[PDB]
Amino acid sequence: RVPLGNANLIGREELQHARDAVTSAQAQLDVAIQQYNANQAMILGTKLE
Amino acid sequence: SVVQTVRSSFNNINASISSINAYKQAVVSAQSSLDAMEAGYSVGTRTIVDVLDA
């Protein structure tokens, strides 16, 4: 969507919303990463026995 | 009869001028739409049928 915006051939609200969606997706990925890290802190030994 | 004919011709000239202005505006609008459709296709958000229709 970005290049079309350089010219005035796409609504500015739509580009704003695309940017916001990117940011939200990044934040949710961070949430998932932190959950995985939280679980990993209990089994960091790397040996079952 | 001559009176009415000349008056009618004059009004016709004026109507022609107005119609020409309208059609120029329509042409510009269509050109803008075609440019939008072509850019969308170049970036990959539209097919080629849209380009041909424009």
mmCIF file of N, CA, C and O in Angstrom:
data_model
loop_
_atom_site.group_PDB
_atom_site.id
_atom_site.type_symbol
_atom_site.label_atom_id
_atom_site.label_comp_id
_atom_site.label_asym_id
_atom_site.label_seq_id
_atom_site.Cartn_x
_atom_site.Cartn_y
_atom_site.Cartn_z
ATOM 1 N N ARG A 1 0.797 -1.223 0.000
ATOM 2 C CA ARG A 1 0.000 0.000 0.000
ATOM 3 C C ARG A 1 0.831 1.275 0.000
ATOM 4 O O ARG A 1 0.336 2.312 -0.452
ATOM 5 N N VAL A 2 2.065 1.234 0.497
ATOM 6 C CA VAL A 2 2.811 2.476 0.714
ATOM 7 C C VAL A 2 3.009 3.274 -0.571
ATOM 8 O O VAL A 2 2.618 4.448 -0.606
ATOM 9 N N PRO A 3 3.598 2.723 -1.640
ATOM 10 C CA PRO A 3 3.953 3.580 -2.786
ATOM 11 C C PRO A 3 2.780 4.340 -3.379
ATOM 12 O O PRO A 3 2.943 5.503 -3.769
ATOM 13 N N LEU A 4 1.602 3.723 -3.463
ATOM 14 C CA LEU A 4 0.441 4.431 -3.991
ATOM 15 C C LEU A 4 0.173 5.696 -3.193
ATOM 16 O O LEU A 4 -0.272 6.709 -3.742
ATOM 17 N N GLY A 5 0.432 5.654 -1.884
ATOM 18 C CA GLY A 5 0.239 6.822 -1.045
ATOM 19 C C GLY A 5 1.128 7.991 -1.405
ATOM 20 O O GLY A 5 0.723 9.144 -1.227
ATOM 21 N N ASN A 6 2.338 7.722 -1.901
ATOM 22 C CA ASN A 6 3.230 8.812 -2.280
ATOM 23 C C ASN A 6 2.528 9.779 -3.221
ATOM 24 O O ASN A 6 2.578 10.999 -3.024
ATOM 25 N N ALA A 7 1.872 9.256 -4.249
ATOM 26 C CA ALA A 7 0.877 10.003 -5.000
ATOM 27 C C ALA A 7 -0.443 9.963 -4.246
ATOM 28 O O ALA A 7 -0.664 9.112 -3.382
ATOM 29 N N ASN A 8 -1.324 10.899 -4.573
ATOM 30 C CA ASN A 8 -2.605 10.996 -3.878
ATOM 31 C C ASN A 8 -3.657 10.125 -4.570
ATOM 32 O O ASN A 8 -4.651 10.607 -5.110
ATOM 33 N N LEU A 9 -3.420 8.815 -4.542
ATOM 34 C CA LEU A 9 -4.309 7.843 -5.167
ATOM 35 C C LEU A 9 -4.757 6.775 -4.176
ATOM 36 O O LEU A 9 -5.093 5.655 -4.556
ATOM 37 N N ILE A 10 -4.775 7.111 -2.890
ATOM 38 C CA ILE A 10 -5.264 6.198 -1.864
ATOM 39 C C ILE A 10 -5.564 6.994 -0.604
ATOM 40 O O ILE A 10 -4.811 7.904 -0.240
ATOM 41 N N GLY A 11 -6.660 6.658 0.070
ATOM 42 C CA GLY A 11 -7.042 7.409 1.253
ATOM 43 C C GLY A 11 -5.966 7.343 2.320
ATOM 44 O O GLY A 11 -5.318 6.312 2.516
ATOM 45 N N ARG A 12 -5.776 8.463 3.019
ATOM 46 C CA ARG A 12 -4.752 8.517 4.055
ATOM 47 C C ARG A 12 -5.145 7.694 5.275
ATOM 48 O O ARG A 12 -4.274 7.121 5.947
ATOM 49 N N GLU A 13 -6.444 7.606 5.567
ATOM 50 C CA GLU A 13 -6.891 6.769 6.672
ATOM 51 C C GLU A 13 -6.495 5.315 6.452
ATOM 52 O O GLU A 13 -6.108 4.619 7.398
ATOM 53 N N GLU A 14 -6.592 4.835 5.212
ATOM 54 C CA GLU A 14 -6.261 3.442 4.932
ATOM 55 C C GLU A 14 -4.785 3.160 5.195
ATOM 56 O O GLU A 14 -4.433 2.129 5.784
ATOM 57 N N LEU A 15 -3.906 4.064 4.764
ATOM 58 C CA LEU A 15 -2.480 3.891 5.019
ATOM 59 C C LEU A 15 -2.179 3.950 6.512
ATOM 60 O O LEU A 15 -1.379 3.153 7.030
ATOM 61 N N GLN A 16 -2.809 4.890 7.220
ATOM 62 C CA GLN A 16 -2.663 4.943 8.670
ATOM 63 C C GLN A 16 -3.055 3.614 9.303
ATOM 64 O O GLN A 16 -2.358 3.107 10.193
ATOM 65 N N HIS A 17 -4.170 3.035 8.855
ATOM 66 C CA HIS A 17 -4.633 1.775 9.426
ATOM 67 C C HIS A 17 -3.665 0.641 9.125
ATOM 68 O O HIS A 17 -3.450 -0.236 9.968
ATOM 69 N N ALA A 18 -3.080 0.629 7.927
ATOM 70 C CA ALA A 18 -2.083 -0.391 7.615
ATOM 71 C C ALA A 18 -0.891 -0.291 8.562
ATOM 72 O O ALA A 18 -0.405 -1.303 9.092
ATOM 73 N N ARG A 19 -0.412 0.931 8.791
ATOM 74 C CA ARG A 19 0.698 1.126 9.720
ATOM 75 C C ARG A 19 0.335 0.618 11.113
ATOM 76 O O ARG A 19 1.123 -0.084 11.769
ATOM 77 N N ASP A 20 -0.866 0.964 11.575
ATOM 78 C CA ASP A 20 -1.300 0.534 12.899
ATOM 79 C C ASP A 20 -1.374 -0.985 12.986
ATOM 80 O O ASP A 20 -1.020 -1.575 14.015
ATOM 81 N N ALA A 21 -1.845 -1.635 11.922
ATOM 82 C CA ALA A 21 -1.916 -3.090 11.920
ATOM 83 C C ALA A 21 -0.529 -3.701 12.043
ATOM 84 O O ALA A 21 -0.331 -4.673 12.785
ATOM 85 N N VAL A 22 0.444 -3.149 11.318
ATOM 86 C CA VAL A 22 1.816 -3.643 11.432
ATOM 87 C C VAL A 22 2.288 -3.549 12.879
ATOM 88 O O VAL A 22 2.851 -4.504 13.440
ATOM 89 N N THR A 23 2.060 -2.395 13.507
ATOM 90 C CA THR A 23 2.535 -2.208 14.876
ATOM 91 C C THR A 23 1.872 -3.196 15.832
ATOM 92 O O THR A 23 2.537 -3.787 16.699
ATOM 93 N N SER A 24 0.560 -3.394 15.687
ATOM 94 C CA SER A 24 -0.148 -4.320 16.563
ATOM 95 C C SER A 24 0.371 -5.743 16.396
ATOM 96 O O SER A 24 0.529 -6.477 17.382
ATOM 97 N N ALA A 25 0.622 -6.157 15.154
ATOM 98 C CA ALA A 25 1.150 -7.496 14.927
ATOM 99 C C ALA A 25 2.505 -7.666 15.598
ATOM 100 O O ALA A 25 2.782 -8.710 16.209
ATOM 101 N N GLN A 26 3.362 -6.648 15.504
ATOM 102 C CA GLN A 26 4.651 -6.721 16.185
ATOM 103 C C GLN A 26 4.466 -6.902 17.689
ATOM 104 O O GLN A 26 5.137 -7.736 18.317
ATOM 105 N N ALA A 27 3.551 -6.133 18.283
ATOM 106 C CA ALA A 27 3.336 -6.239 19.724
ATOM 107 C C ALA A 27 2.862 -7.635 20.118
ATOM 108 O O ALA A 27 3.325 -8.203 21.120
ATOM 109 N N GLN A 28 1.937 -8.206 19.349
ATOM 110 C CA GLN A 28 1.436 -9.536 19.693
ATOM 111 C C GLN A 28 2.525 -10.596 19.550
ATOM 112 O O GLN A 28 2.597 -11.542 20.353
ATOM 113 N N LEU A 29 3.386 -10.460 18.539
ATOM 114 C CA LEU A 29 4.522 -11.371 18.443
ATOM 115 C C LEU A 29 5.406 -11.262 19.678
ATOM 116 O O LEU A 29 5.913 -12.273 20.183
ATOM 117 N N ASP A 30 5.610 -10.040 20.174
ATOM 118 C CA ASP A 30 6.376 -9.877 21.408
ATOM 119 C C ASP A 30 5.709 -10.611 22.566
ATOM 120 O O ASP A 30 6.387 -11.237 23.393
ATOM 121 N N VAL A 31 4.381 -10.535 22.648
ATOM 122 C CA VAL A 31 3.664 -11.248 23.706
ATOM 123 C C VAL A 31 3.971 -12.740 23.640
ATOM 124 O O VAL A 31 4.286 -13.380 24.655
ATOM 125 N N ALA A 32 3.871 -13.316 22.442
ATOM 126 C CA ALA A 32 4.132 -14.747 22.294
ATOM 127 C C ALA A 32 5.565 -15.089 22.690
ATOM 128 O O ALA A 32 5.813 -16.099 23.369
ATOM 129 N N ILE A 33 6.522 -14.261 22.269
ATOM 130 C CA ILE A 33 7.919 -14.505 22.614
ATOM 131 C C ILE A 33 8.096 -14.525 24.124
ATOM 132 O O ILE A 33 8.802 -15.379 24.673
ATOM 133 N N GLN A 34 7.475 -13.573 24.817
ATOM 134 C CA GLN A 34 7.643 -13.514 26.263
ATOM 135 C C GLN A 34 7.008 -14.718 26.942
ATOM 136 O O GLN A 34 7.543 -15.229 27.929
ATOM 137 N N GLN A 35 5.870 -15.192 26.433
ATOM 138 C CA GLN A 35 5.281 -16.400 27.006
ATOM 139 C C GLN A 35 6.233 -17.583 26.867
ATOM 140 O O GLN A 35 6.469 -18.335 27.827
ATOM 141 N N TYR A 36 6.814 -17.742 25.677
ATOM 142 C CA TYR A 36 7.757 -18.835 25.466
ATOM 143 C C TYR A 36 8.947 -18.723 26.408
ATOM 144 O O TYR A 36 9.384 -19.722 26.989
ATOM 145 N N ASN A 37 9.486 -17.514 26.572
ATOM 146 C CA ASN A 37 10.588 -17.325 27.510
ATOM 147 C C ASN A 37 10.171 -17.699 28.924
ATOM 148 O O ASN A 37 10.941 -18.320 29.664
ATOM 149 N N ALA A 38 8.952 -17.328 29.317
ATOM 150 C CA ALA A 38 8.486 -17.635 30.662
ATOM 151 C C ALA A 38 8.467 -19.134 30.907
ATOM 152 O O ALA A 38 8.892 -19.600 31.969
ATOM 153 N N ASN A 39 7.982 -19.913 29.940
ATOM 154 C CA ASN A 39 7.991 -21.362 30.142
ATOM 155 C C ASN A 39 9.412 -21.909 30.192
ATOM 156 O O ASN A 39 9.702 -22.831 30.961
ATOM 157 N N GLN A 40 10.309 -21.361 29.373
ATOM 158 C CA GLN A 40 11.655 -21.905 29.257
ATOM 159 C C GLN A 40 12.466 -21.765 30.538
ATOM 160 O O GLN A 40 13.437 -22.505 30.722
ATOM 161 N N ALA A 41 12.098 -20.843 31.425
ATOM 162 C CA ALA A 41 12.912 -20.581 32.604
ATOM 163 C C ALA A 41 12.894 -21.724 33.607
ATOM 164 O O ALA A 41 13.728 -21.734 34.517
ATOM 165 N N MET A 42 11.976 -22.679 33.468
ATOM 166 C CA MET A 42 11.882 -23.793 34.399
ATOM 167 C C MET A 42 12.641 -25.030 33.940
ATOM 168 O O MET A 42 12.916 -25.906 34.765
ATOM 169 N N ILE A 43 12.987 -25.124 32.657
ATOM 170 C CA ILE A 43 13.598 -26.327 32.104
ATOM 171 C C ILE A 43 14.891 -25.975 31.382
ATOM 172 O O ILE A 43 15.281 -26.649 30.422
ATOM 173 N N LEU A 44 15.554 -24.912 31.842
ATOM 174 C CA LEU A 44 16.808 -24.423 31.211
ATOM 175 C C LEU A 44 17.967 -25.393 31.479
ATOM 176 O O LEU A 44 19.049 -25.141 30.918
ATOM 177 N N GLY A 45 17.791 -26.440 32.299
ATOM 178 C CA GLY A 45 18.896 -27.330 32.620
ATOM 179 C C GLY A 45 19.417 -28.102 31.424
ATOM 180 O O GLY A 45 20.619 -28.362 31.326
ATOM 181 N N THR A 46 18.531 -28.480 30.506
ATOM 182 C CA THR A 46 18.880 -29.179 29.272
ATOM 183 C C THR A 46 19.248 -30.641 29.502
ATOM 184 O O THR A 46 19.905 -31.253 28.654
ATOM 185 N N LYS A 47 18.843 -31.223 30.629
ATOM 186 C CA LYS A 47 19.025 -32.648 30.878
ATOM 187 C C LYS A 47 17.838 -33.159 31.676
ATOM 188 O O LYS A 47 17.503 -32.594 32.721
ATOM 189 N N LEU A 48 17.209 -34.230 31.186
ATOM 190 C CA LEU A 48 16.011 -34.741 31.843
ATOM 191 C C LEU A 48 16.322 -35.273 33.236
ATOM 192 O O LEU A 48 15.555 -35.043 34.178
ATOM 193 N N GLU A 49 17.440 -35.979 33.390
ATOM 194 C CA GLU A 49 17.797 -36.601 34.657
ATOM 195 C C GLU A 49 18.604 -35.677 35.558
ATOM 196 O O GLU A 49 19.336 -36.161 36.430
ATOM 197 N N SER B 1 -40.719 33.613 -38.841
ATOM 198 C CA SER B 1 -39.933 32.386 -38.897
ATOM 199 C C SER B 1 -38.445 32.685 -38.769
ATOM 200 O O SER B 1 -37.711 31.971 -38.073
ATOM 201 N N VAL B 2 -37.980 33.739 -39.439
ATOM 202 C CA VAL B 2 -36.571 34.108 -39.319
ATOM 203 C C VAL B 2 -36.245 34.467 -37.880
ATOM 204 O O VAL B 2 -35.191 34.079 -37.348
ATOM 205 N N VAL B 3 -37.133 35.220 -37.232
ATOM 206 C CA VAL B 3 -36.925 35.559 -35.827
ATOM 207 C C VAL B 3 -36.674 34.304 -34.997
ATOM 208 O O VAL B 3 -35.634 34.173 -34.317
ATOM 209 N N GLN B 4 -37.619 33.363 -35.038
ATOM 210 C CA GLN B 4 -37.488 32.187 -34.184
ATOM 211 C C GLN B 4 -36.247 31.375 -34.532
ATOM 212 O O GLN B 4 -35.558 30.881 -33.627
ATOM 213 N N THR B 5 -35.931 31.244 -35.821
ATOM 214 C CA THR B 5 -34.775 30.450 -36.214
ATOM 215 C C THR B 5 -33.483 31.027 -35.646
ATOM 216 O O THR B 5 -32.654 30.290 -35.091
ATOM 217 N N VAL B 6 -33.281 32.341 -35.780
ATOM 218 C CA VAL B 6 -32.021 32.910 -35.306
ATOM 219 C C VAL B 6 -31.908 32.769 -33.791
ATOM 220 O O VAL B 6 -30.837 32.421 -33.261
ATOM 221 N N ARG B 7 -33.005 33.011 -33.066
ATOM 222 C CA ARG B 7 -32.939 32.847 -31.615
ATOM 223 C C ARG B 7 -32.548 31.417 -31.240
ATOM 224 O O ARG B 7 -31.686 31.194 -30.369
ATOM 225 N N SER B 8 -33.166 30.432 -31.897
ATOM 226 C CA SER B 8 -32.872 29.042 -31.568
ATOM 227 C C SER B 8 -31.411 28.713 -31.838
ATOM 228 O O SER B 8 -30.760 28.023 -31.039
ATOM 229 N N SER B 9 -30.872 29.199 -32.956
ATOM 230 C CA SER B 9 -29.471 28.931 -33.255
ATOM 231 C C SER B 9 -28.562 29.482 -32.164
ATOM 232 O O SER B 9 -27.605 28.814 -31.736
ATOM 233 N N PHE B 10 -28.842 30.700 -31.697
ATOM 234 C CA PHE B 10 -28.012 31.289 -30.647
ATOM 235 C C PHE B 10 -28.010 30.411 -29.394
ATOM 236 O O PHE B 10 -26.944 30.081 -28.830
ATOM 237 N N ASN B 11 -29.202 30.011 -28.949
ATOM 238 C CA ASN B 11 -29.273 29.164 -27.760
ATOM 239 C C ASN B 11 -28.503 27.865 -27.970
ATOM 240 O O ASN B 11 -27.865 27.348 -27.039
ATOM 241 N N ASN B 12 -28.546 27.323 -29.189
ATOM 242 C CA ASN B 12 -27.819 26.088 -29.463
ATOM 243 C C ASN B 12 -26.317 26.279 -29.293
ATOM 244 O O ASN B 12 -25.630 25.402 -28.751
ATOM 245 N N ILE B 13 -25.783 27.412 -29.754
ATOM 246 C CA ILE B 13 -24.348 27.648 -29.577
ATOM 247 C C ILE B 13 -23.999 27.622 -28.093
ATOM 248 O O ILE B 13 -23.008 26.999 -27.666
ATOM 249 N N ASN B 14 -24.810 28.305 -27.280
ATOM 250 C CA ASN B 14 -24.503 28.349 -25.847
ATOM 251 C C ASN B 14 -24.521 26.948 -25.232
ATOM 252 O O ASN B 14 -23.628 26.578 -24.443
ATOM 253 N N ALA B 15 -25.528 26.150 -25.592
ATOM 254 C CA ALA B 15 -25.607 24.792 -25.065
ATOM 255 C C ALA B 15 -24.378 23.982 -25.453
ATOM 256 O O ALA B 15 -23.865 23.188 -24.652
ATOM 257 N N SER B 16 -23.896 24.164 -26.684
ATOM 258 C CA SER B 16 -22.705 23.440 -27.115
ATOM 259 C C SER B 16 -21.506 23.785 -26.243
ATOM 260 O O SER B 16 -20.731 22.897 -25.854
ATOM 261 N N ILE B 17 -21.329 25.069 -25.928
ATOM 262 C CA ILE B 17 -20.212 25.457 -25.062
ATOM 263 C C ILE B 17 -20.290 24.713 -23.729
ATOM 264 O O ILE B 17 -19.303 24.116 -23.254
ATOM 265 N N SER B 18 -21.470 24.741 -23.100
ATOM 266 C CA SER B 18 -21.600 24.089 -21.794
ATOM 267 C C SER B 18 -21.291 22.596 -21.884
ATOM 268 O O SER B 18 -20.592 22.034 -21.021
ATOM 269 N N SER B 19 -21.802 21.935 -22.924
ATOM 270 C CA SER B 19 -21.558 20.505 -23.074
ATOM 271 C C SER B 19 -20.068 20.215 -23.218
ATOM 272 O O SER B 19 -19.564 19.223 -22.672
ATOM 273 N N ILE B 20 -19.349 21.059 -23.961
ATOM 274 C CA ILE B 20 -17.911 20.849 -24.123
ATOM 275 C C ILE B 20 -17.218 20.882 -22.768
ATOM 276 O O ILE B 20 -16.354 20.044 -22.466
ATOM 277 N N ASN B 21 -17.573 21.863 -21.935
ATOM 278 C CA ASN B 21 -16.951 21.932 -20.611
ATOM 279 C C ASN B 21 -17.213 20.653 -19.814
ATOM 280 O O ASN B 21 -16.294 20.072 -19.204
ATOM 281 N N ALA B 22 -18.465 20.193 -19.821
ATOM 282 C CA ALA B 22 -18.797 18.976 -19.082
ATOM 283 C C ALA B 22 -17.946 17.802 -19.549
ATOM 284 O O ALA B 22 -17.411 17.034 -18.735
ATOM 285 N N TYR B 23 -17.808 17.646 -20.866
ATOM 286 C CA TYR B 23 -17.095 16.487 -21.387
ATOM 287 C C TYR B 23 -15.610 16.550 -21.050
ATOM 288 O O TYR B 23 -14.988 15.515 -20.775
ATOM 289 N N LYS B 24 -15.021 17.746 -21.051
ATOM 290 C CA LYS B 24 -13.627 17.847 -20.623
ATOM 291 C C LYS B 24 -13.464 17.378 -19.184
ATOM 292 O O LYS B 24 -12.524 16.630 -18.859
ATOM 293 N N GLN B 25 -14.371 17.802 -18.301
ATOM 294 C CA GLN B 25 -14.269 17.353 -16.913
ATOM 295 C C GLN B 25 -14.368 15.835 -16.823
ATOM 296 O O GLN B 25 -13.615 15.190 -16.074
ATOM 297 N N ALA B 26 -15.297 15.245 -17.576
ATOM 298 C CA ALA B 26 -15.441 13.792 -17.554
ATOM 299 C C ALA B 26 -14.153 13.110 -17.997
ATOM 300 O O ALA B 26 -13.740 12.094 -17.415
ATOM 301 N N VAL B 27 -13.509 13.646 -19.034
ATOM 302 C CA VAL B 27 -12.269 13.049 -19.518
ATOM 303 C C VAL B 27 -11.211 13.065 -18.425
ATOM 304 O O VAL B 27 -10.495 12.075 -18.216
ATOM 305 N N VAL B 28 -11.083 14.189 -17.720
ATOM 306 C CA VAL B 28 -10.071 14.259 -16.665
ATOM 307 C C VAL B 28 -10.359 13.230 -15.577
ATOM 308 O O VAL B 28 -9.447 12.550 -15.079
ATOM 309 N N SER B 29 -11.628 13.101 -15.183
ATOM 310 C CA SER B 29 -11.964 12.122 -14.151
ATOM 311 C C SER B 29 -11.589 10.711 -14.590
ATOM 312 O O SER B 29 -11.010 9.933 -13.813
ATOM 313 N N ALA B 30 -11.913 10.362 -15.836
ATOM 314 C CA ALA B 30 -11.595 9.026 -16.323
ATOM 315 C C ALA B 30 -10.091 8.794 -16.344
ATOM 316 O O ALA B 30 -9.619 7.695 -16.023
ATOM 317 N N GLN B 31 -9.319 9.811 -16.729
ATOM 318 C CA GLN B 31 -7.868 9.661 -16.727
ATOM 319 C C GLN B 31 -7.350 9.379 -15.323
ATOM 320 O O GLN B 31 -6.476 8.521 -15.131
ATOM 321 N N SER B 32 -7.868 10.099 -14.327
ATOM 322 C CA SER B 32 -7.433 9.846 -12.957
ATOM 323 C C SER B 32 -7.748 8.415 -12.535
ATOM 324 O O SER B 32 -6.912 7.738 -11.919
ATOM 325 N N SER B 33 -8.951 7.937 -12.861
ATOM 326 C CA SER B 33 -9.312 6.570 -12.491
ATOM 327 C C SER B 33 -8.384 5.556 -13.153
ATOM 328 O O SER B 33 -7.950 4.584 -12.517
ATOM 329 N N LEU B 34 -8.071 5.765 -14.433
ATOM 330 C CA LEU B 34 -7.176 4.843 -15.125
ATOM 331 C C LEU B 34 -5.799 4.832 -14.483
ATOM 332 O O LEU B 34 -5.188 3.768 -14.328
ATOM 333 N N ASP B 35 -5.277 6.008 -14.124
ATOM 334 C CA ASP B 35 -3.969 6.052 -13.478
ATOM 335 C C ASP B 35 -3.985 5.287 -12.163
ATOM 336 O O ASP B 35 -3.051 4.533 -11.859
ATOM 337 N N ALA B 36 -5.044 5.462 -11.372
ATOM 338 C CA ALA B 36 -5.140 4.730 -10.113
ATOM 339 C C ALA B 36 -5.115 3.225 -10.350
ATOM 340 O O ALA B 36 -4.370 2.490 -9.688
ATOM 341 N N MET B 37 -5.946 2.766 -11.298
ATOM 342 C CA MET B 37 -6.083 1.322 -11.624
ATOM 343 C C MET B 37 -4.746 0.764 -12.110
ATOM 344 O O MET B 37 -4.452 -0.387 -11.764
ATOM 345 N N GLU B 38 -4.004 1.518 -12.927
ATOM 346 C CA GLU B 38 -2.720 1.071 -13.446
ATOM 347 C C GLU B 38 -1.685 0.975 -12.334
ATOM 348 O O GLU B 38 -0.905 0.017 -12.289
ATOM 349 N N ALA B 39 -1.651 1.960 -11.433
ATOM 350 C CA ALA B 39 -0.705 1.890 -10.324
ATOM 351 C C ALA B 39 -1.007 0.701 -9.424
ATOM 352 O O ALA B 39 -0.093 -0.018 -8.996
ATOM 353 N N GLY B 40 -2.285 0.469 -9.135
ATOM 354 C CA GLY B 40 -2.644 -0.698 -8.348
ATOM 355 C C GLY B 40 -2.161 -1.987 -8.983
ATOM 356 O O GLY B 40 -1.644 -2.873 -8.299
ATOM 357 N N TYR B 41 -2.323 -2.112 -10.300
ATOM 358 C CA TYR B 41 -1.842 -3.308 -10.982
ATOM 359 C C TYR B 41 -0.324 -3.411 -10.913
ATOM 360 O O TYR B 41 0.223 -4.503 -10.729
ATOM 361 N N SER B 42 0.374 -2.285 -11.062
ATOM 362 C CA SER B 42 1.830 -2.312 -10.994
ATOM 363 C C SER B 42 2.309 -2.812 -9.638
ATOM 364 O O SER B 42 3.261 -3.595 -9.559
ATOM 365 N N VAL B 43 1.662 -2.371 -8.555
ATOM 366 C CA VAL B 43 2.038 -2.861 -7.227
ATOM 367 C C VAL B 43 1.450 -4.226 -6.913
ATOM 368 O O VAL B 43 1.840 -4.838 -5.913
ATOM 369 N N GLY B 44 0.523 -4.718 -7.726
ATOM 370 C CA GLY B 44 0.024 -6.068 -7.588
ATOM 371 C C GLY B 44 -1.264 -6.233 -6.815
ATOM 372 O O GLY B 44 -1.528 -7.338 -6.331
ATOM 373 N N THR B 45 -2.071 -5.184 -6.681
ATOM 374 C CA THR B 45 -3.337 -5.265 -5.966
ATOM 375 C C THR B 45 -4.544 -5.350 -6.889
ATOM 376 O O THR B 45 -5.675 -5.397 -6.398
ATOM 377 N N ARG B 46 -4.339 -5.370 -8.205
ATOM 378 C CA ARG B 46 -5.436 -5.414 -9.160
ATOM 379 C C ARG B 46 -5.047 -6.291 -10.339
ATOM 380 O O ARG B 46 -3.866 -6.494 -10.629
ATOM 381 N N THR B 47 -6.063 -6.807 -11.024
ATOM 382 C CA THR B 47 -5.859 -7.651 -12.192
ATOM 383 C C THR B 47 -5.658 -6.769 -13.424
ATOM 384 O O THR B 47 -5.477 -5.553 -13.326
ATOM 385 N N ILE B 48 -5.686 -7.382 -14.606
ATOM 386 C CA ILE B 48 -5.547 -6.644 -15.856
ATOM 387 C C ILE B 48 -6.900 -6.322 -16.485
ATOM 388 O O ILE B 48 -6.992 -5.378 -17.290
ATOM 389 N N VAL B 49 -7.952 -7.061 -16.129
ATOM 390 C CA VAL B 49 -9.294 -6.737 -16.601
ATOM 391 C C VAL B 49 -9.666 -5.323 -16.183
ATOM 392 O O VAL B 49 -10.296 -4.578 -16.945
ATOM 393 N N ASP B 50 -9.297 -4.934 -14.961
ATOM 394 C CA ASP B 50 -9.589 -3.582 -14.501
ATOM 395 C C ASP B 50 -8.874 -2.547 -15.358
ATOM 396 O O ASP B 50 -9.448 -1.503 -15.697
ATOM 397 N N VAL B 51 -7.621 -2.820 -15.723
ATOM 398 C CA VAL B 51 -6.881 -1.894 -16.572
ATOM 399 C C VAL B 51 -7.586 -1.732 -17.911
ATOM 400 O O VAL B 51 -7.758 -0.612 -18.413
ATOM 401 N N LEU B 52 -8.013 -2.846 -18.506
ATOM 402 C CA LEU B 52 -8.674 -2.760 -19.805
ATOM 403 C C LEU B 52 -10.004 -2.018 -19.704
ATOM 404 O O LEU B 52 -10.349 -1.226 -20.591
ATOM 405 N N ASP B 53 -10.762 -2.252 -18.631
ATOM 406 C CA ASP B 53 -12.028 -1.547 -18.460
ATOM 407 C C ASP B 53 -11.808 -0.045 -18.321
ATOM 408 O O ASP B 53 -12.547 0.764 -18.906
ATOM 409 N N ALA B 54 -10.793 0.350 -17.547
ATOM 410 C CA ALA B 54 -10.480 1.767 -17.414
ATOM 411 C C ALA B 54 -10.103 2.369 -18.760
ATOM 412 O O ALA B 54 -10.520 3.489 -19.092
#
